[PDB]
Amino acid sequence: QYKLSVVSGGKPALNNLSSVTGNKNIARLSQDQRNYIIPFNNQIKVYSVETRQCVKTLKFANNSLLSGIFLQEEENNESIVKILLGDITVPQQAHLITVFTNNGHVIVLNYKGKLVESPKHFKISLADEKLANVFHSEGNYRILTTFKHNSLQSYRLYALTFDDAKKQFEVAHQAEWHNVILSNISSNGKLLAHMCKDVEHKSISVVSLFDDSVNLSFPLGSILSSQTQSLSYNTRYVSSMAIDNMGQQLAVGFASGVISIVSLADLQIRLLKWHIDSVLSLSFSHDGSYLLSGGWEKVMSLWQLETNSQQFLPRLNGIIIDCQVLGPQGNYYSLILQMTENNSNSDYQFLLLNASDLTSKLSINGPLPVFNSTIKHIQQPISAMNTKNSNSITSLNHSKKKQSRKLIKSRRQDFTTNVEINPINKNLYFPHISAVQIFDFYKNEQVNYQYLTSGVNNSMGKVRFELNLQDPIITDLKFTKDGQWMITYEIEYPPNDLLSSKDLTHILKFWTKNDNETNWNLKTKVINPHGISVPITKILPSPRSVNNSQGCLTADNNGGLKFWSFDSHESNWCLKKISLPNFNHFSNSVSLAWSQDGSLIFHGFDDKLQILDFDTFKKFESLENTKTVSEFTLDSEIQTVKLINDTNLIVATRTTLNAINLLRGQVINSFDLYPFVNGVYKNGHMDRLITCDERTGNIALVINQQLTDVPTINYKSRIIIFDSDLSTKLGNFTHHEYISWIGWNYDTDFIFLDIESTLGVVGTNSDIFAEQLHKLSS
Amino acid sequence: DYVQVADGLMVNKGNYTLNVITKALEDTTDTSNDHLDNKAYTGSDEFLSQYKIKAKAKVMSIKIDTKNSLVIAILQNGLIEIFDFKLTLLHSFDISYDNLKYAKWFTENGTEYVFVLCPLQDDKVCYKLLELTDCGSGESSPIKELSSTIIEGFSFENSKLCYQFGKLYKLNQGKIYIYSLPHCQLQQVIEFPMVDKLSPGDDLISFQPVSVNRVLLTVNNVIYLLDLLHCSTLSQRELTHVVINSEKSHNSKTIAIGISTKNGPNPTSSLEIINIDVGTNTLKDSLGKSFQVGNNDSSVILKPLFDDKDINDKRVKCNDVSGDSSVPVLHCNEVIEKLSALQDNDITSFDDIFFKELKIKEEHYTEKDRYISDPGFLNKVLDLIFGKFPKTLTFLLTHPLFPLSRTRNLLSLLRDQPRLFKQAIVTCPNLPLNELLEELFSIRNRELLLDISFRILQDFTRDSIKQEMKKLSKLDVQNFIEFITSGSTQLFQLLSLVLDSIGLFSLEGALLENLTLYIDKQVEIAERNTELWNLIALPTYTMEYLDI
Amino acid sequence: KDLASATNYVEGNARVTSGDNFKHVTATTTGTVTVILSQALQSNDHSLLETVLNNRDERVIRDTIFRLKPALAVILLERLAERIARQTHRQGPLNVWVKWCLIIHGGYLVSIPNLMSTLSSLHSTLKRRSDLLPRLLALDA
Amino acid sequence: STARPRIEQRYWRQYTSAQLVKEHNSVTHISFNPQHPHDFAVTSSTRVQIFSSRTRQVIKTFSRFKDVVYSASFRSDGKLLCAGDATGLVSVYDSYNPRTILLSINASTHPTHVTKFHTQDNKILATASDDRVTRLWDISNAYEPQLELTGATDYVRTLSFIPAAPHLVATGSYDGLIRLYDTRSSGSTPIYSLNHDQPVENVIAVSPTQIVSCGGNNFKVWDLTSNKKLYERGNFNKAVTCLDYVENFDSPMQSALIASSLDGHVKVFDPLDNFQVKFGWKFSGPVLSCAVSPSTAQGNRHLVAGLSSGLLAIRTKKKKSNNFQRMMRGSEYQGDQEHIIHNDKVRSQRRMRAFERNINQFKWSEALDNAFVPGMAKELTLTVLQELRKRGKVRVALYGRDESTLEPLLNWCLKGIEDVRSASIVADWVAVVLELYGNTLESSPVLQELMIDLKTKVRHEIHKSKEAQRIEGMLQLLT
RNA sequence: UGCGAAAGCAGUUGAAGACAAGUGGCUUGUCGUUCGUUAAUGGCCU
């Protein structure tokens, strides 16, 4: 009765091609600017901008029709690169969109109501392994193609020509060049500009594509002044650029933060200077009097050119990556946030905002997970320094070779994310770096985003030396599982080169929400329980046995345990009972368990399963000594002690499995675990890997890593479901892509999470007059 | 599923009262009663009585007589009140009701004319019951239930003659059908090893359970779901479980089949005619504290042989789970042959255990984690190496690295060989703090003592250390404190342990003042090496020299 | 507020406390003052409680703390915990007050079963102090 | 986009304007207007003084009594007032007009100690002198009472009624022995007596079901529907002199009752959770007659304390042209009877300060300067030091300063090392500045005076911390 | 860079190609180069 069904949405899937872009955004509007056609990795979303909802999705698994283009195993780099508005084949005749992914697969997708099940899966001849773009105007569409050196691609401008041979589009081969380090297209597409690197120095060209009009090249050594002839490469290096639609103005945003403006005929130099970090986002208006700029500071800054001044937008809560205006009269700013508070994933954030009061309409998220390391081609953006958030200019080949060969020669690849599920409304919390993301996966979006520290997350853009002021990372938060409290615990760091910079220090607090609001109010905080400088790593919440989920027992890596129960005579949270066995050793590989009726407390220390009672906080030493065994000892270093119900149990160590019965105080069964995992985990991570059902056990997940023919970029989910304390392998669900965690949603189902972040689940005459008046309505 | 087991009318009171059981007796006239009092008069007795009941006040009692009637008796005053003989066949197991709770004239023939606890308060004739043999009176909404050998189940309530429910319950010849403590079921015992709890809301068997020992007298206590089953040839009542606010411990019901073991409390000494010794003192069933001891209906010590995955052909998609021997030899036949080789006819030499450890599974002369280990195989291997064979070089370097020895390690203080004891006091985590404490309070003070103090801080809790060191020989600790005051942080935290263990006053002043000087140079070395730790333009005119 | 952006962190009016403490689970020698301390711990009155406990002298503090009752020694030690919680600038002469209840009364607080529950102010405050005492000695050295 | 983040007993201690007026003798007890106690009377010797809720002095008084007077009591309508003296000729006369006397009728020749009207009837007045009998006089025909309420063993001294139950009069004598007579009875027996021990000081009825009596060094409660006590309190130096009760006023306590006990502090218990004080505030000695005003004082609310010396302490809580106006007339309509209503307001927040906006604009230097001034708060300075250490780099905050700017930092760490919560962090502050600024002190040898002064006081404080740690080590040993 | 723990433990620290500069040639420094080792006065609004 169980089966794989991958359901919910994932990443926005932009042009994740380092310098192979000038736009890196094809989230288009209709020509009636009311609905937003945005691609994903998992869907196509059509949004009503007047309500910020989805009027129609085109999911990437519901049709084999489309997903023959992308449902394969290792070639899942089928990313989506261009959207046009009308039928390309027929001349302008009604409104259904066309779609190109990275392989030149022409798709003609339906746009209104319900789709017709014949998408014209057209394909041009040469588009075998490429698509940079096509560029659009009336009639003529001109494809930018890439062939193969010094790590420079070759860009060619061919034309889609299609007049009467109704089953073949043929290219027309206008332009050729073989050297690109950075390129860009205009906001109307009628002009582009690239660089060439061709030594007596590097050079920059600006070319037309729809005529013979303006085709020129010039070395940028003239644009580089004597100050940047002298000083370092962060001043010599172009970070971003922009061109005008007219063809008389070229912005070059240099990596220091200066924004040069050069002309076309006379080639003057003109300098714009406010940005302190590097600049990544440069675009002109359609009239070319305002220059939109977004850098690593959290501000959206737009320059009026004929005053050379600026209007700000202070707190975008992230890092701006690309921005332009795209209204035909120029009323809508499309842009990409990134918010690199987690360096693991390139988790962007698509949004547009009005030009009226700069209010944001339809912040389009993906699910933003909290991994442990970089995933699969996760490069870092170009800053001036090799900071903790990104690498510098000189470490491009260095960091890409380091990450690629690290994933080749590594053996430690867990990145197991911790989440939670809310028993009020069944949305899943991604506890972010010093924050949360409450994702309601029923319609694959968010609801809010609360900050969870009193740090420097919000009120300051992180600049070149403040980037190493990382924010206090939270580890986890516990729901009171009536859905009432976020009991969060977080670790915090100081800036380095300080005597108090040694320790990473700890703080917990308590959050209450009503069912009305989506935020949480802070009830109380507790700064370093169990004394100072002690981790509080494993805390367990309680069922409705004691006071309708008021029990939360805090633990330690040292092995101390305290009990914590809410009360109302003291309108506050406080503790109940105290224990700190101060071992002079420590071990952060600790699990815990607790009985669902409230009887047994299980401390799974470093290979000793000590047993306390509930009532008196101590080791149960009764008055009989007839198999009242209140201390187990397991085979090796364990990571989980899990109780599925009050009779039997699963403990998990590094090498094998074991099952325990406690009414019948013995061991039961065993499965192998080291034939599955080699060295993949860090200690304590099997706890957040597997999570029990209320009835039907748990799903131990096989961690695999598919070898080359070192691991290649094929991956696994061959998950085998277990029922009722290690009894049946009743389903081996096969899948070609990775996994991080599996949780239980309360309809006896098991939601799993992909790294390519797709959430899924294994679970259970007057009529003619009326019609013609409906046609005459508009 | 059992509880704490021991012990090898008025149905709610107990001792300190007048007479809570004027109880019927087999091989007597009808009945008798005894105090640990009141009279036991004639209630139109002298019949085939096997049971007896009253009006639960011990002054208007009766004697349940097999003549279809129940006439009142006088047990306190002497003025018995009149009654009415209803049936004419057998009422030797009759019982009066409360003030209009449950009374009907279904004596032995299913003739259930409903009435009250009176002779003149009569109700409608609910005589539609078939030929039944199991008549029970429960207090859910007071209800007489009939299980019939025409097999059927039914229940009626004596409020306005309301037949609640009933179906065709296939009830055969059983042993003991008591009601359940939750009142919505009944433990109806099958003959030898079985007692089915049947949910008495629809006469359906809800859980047909098996019994660990012989079940002959099953009676459900004033508990959550606990019953007592007394065996055939004994007065032993096993306490099993499947009323929670003030849970009763004794004087719940009067039912057993032991050696005249009626009036069944936990302390069932004061009986009605028996006058016997006493038994259990256990309360009702707890939440989850009794079930960790009460391991009945299943008693075994077993484990699987580490079952692998359901074989996955992935020779094109290998898992990167080893560069070494992933699937090792878990051959129990090879392990049995190797252990029989170690305890075989070569046993005169240490080669008999060395070559057996070689011909056993791939343990690299010291290393665990090839868990070729069932509990019986493990303890027989440990017995053949702990027999009358510190000798072997492979096996006794393989066994400091074992987390499982489980209390035969009292021998470790007595056996005194240096390097095996050093490996055992650094690695194997089964050597208790008693042995650790006397080996610490040895006064030869070498790296053995350093390593066991490191082990006491690596494994042993401070509160157990304190309450174990509270009462021991004072001469060892005072001699060691004098030695260390004359002439390392493991020893200083052990000094903290013993100098919290000293108590308040039970010492002298000169030795402790010299210890105060020792700890004065301790505070000065502490402050001086933490000091070591956190230690670790142009003026107006000058006269210049330059060459010409 | 724009619901396309993140909501802001705040504490509001949360009760700030670290993870330590919980409440729910004829002369012939010297005549030093007793009955004024008795009527002082009848009420909670700062003026007369200061005129009895403004003391500084060793034998005076000894005789006062011992010659009062052991049924008030618990709440007297808790009131001295209140004093060292209100201020620790002037801590020198009143540390003597805090310490002599622990010195001269030894059996009564031990026979009292709930020490750390009702006494959750004093040793919790002194261990809040002595938490950063390794850090304080490191900083000062 | 978004904004920028920002980083009971209090009610009874916001009672102030506690002024003093010394009488010429002691204050027996007081009274309050029952319909509106915006005036109140105190019973001075040979005069009764009546004060308002505004001017807080005598607005009217009567002083043609000839002996010391004892009892002043308003009728429930609050128009006339009764006064009993030591002569035993109890006088009733109209209030808000002192110079008229309605009727002065003699009681027994013993001094009439207490005299109070019926709580709901407007024409029958209870008097009690030391004749061992109390009287329910009728002011329509004040020639003989209706009831010679006899049945006392000695010295009937304090009267009260039961509020909702009319026929029950609770009198109290100097025998314990709180009697409660029925007015339809013979006037010789109560239906039962309440067994107080001491001579009762006075008794009030705080419910129609529960009364509180006080006499001796503890006060008692008494149930009347079952003759039961549920409560006593005796934490007073002398006997609880007077009682008072109030219902439904503006506090975190719904209803209060106070007991005043000749020992400075007056205690404020509550029948919400069985009679615990919030906090009792002292006075200038033997407090004899002390009460706060009743419910309908409407904001402005006075507590008065007439001591046995006689000084009254009064502590009170107190909460262009027509053509231009026609030009700007439509300012208050605010959208009542028309279709839709917009609301797009930004809120004028709390007052952002100069140091706060210095943090907002990275003005770290003048943020430090605004921290280290005596005009700003000390805990504000601690919090801004903690927050800017957590926020920014102290190196780039101190990247160009000298010792003339560094000196208030050291001058305030001089007193802030002794703190409990900021000791090691201000030690880290001086640690950074001496970590990177030794060249300044070796050029200018000035501020090492404060460095060595700091050193000796921090040796004192580290000795203090060491001895505190070993004293809690004594607690650990005697656990 | 690897393990591990809020801890120490082991190593990279290469080469080629091209260019720049000082002196056809030589000498000093780099690379939005293939390969290997796990190693710029420019700062946040209504």
Coordinates of N, CA and C (backbone and C1' of nucleotides) in Angstrom, one line a residue, chain D residues 4 362 364, chain E residues 43-45:
Chain D
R4 N 14.0 48.1 10.6 CA 15.3 47.9 11.3 C 15.0 47.5 12.7
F362 N 26.5 53.6 11.8 CA 27.9 53.2 12.1 C 28.8 54.3 12.6
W364 N 30.5 54.9 15.3 CA 30.9 54.1 16.5 C 31.6 55.0 17.5
Chain E
rG43 P 30.2 56.7 0.9 O5' 30.1 56.0 2.3 C5' 28.8 55.7 2.9 C4' 28.5 54.2 2.6 C3' 27.4 53.6 3.5 O3' 26.1 54.0 3.2 C1' 29.2 52.2 3.4
rC44 P 25.1 54.7 4.2 O5' 23.8 53.8 4.3 C5' 22.6 54.2 3.6 C4' 21.5 53.2 3.8 C3' 20.8 53.3 5.1 O3' 19.4 53.0 5.0 C1' 21.6 51.1 4.7
rC45 P 18.4 53.6 6.1 O5' 17.8 55.0 5.4 C5' 17.4 56.1 6.2 C4' 16.8 57.1 5.3 C3' 15.3 57.3 5.5 O3' 14.9 58.2 6.5 C1' 15.9 57.2 3.2

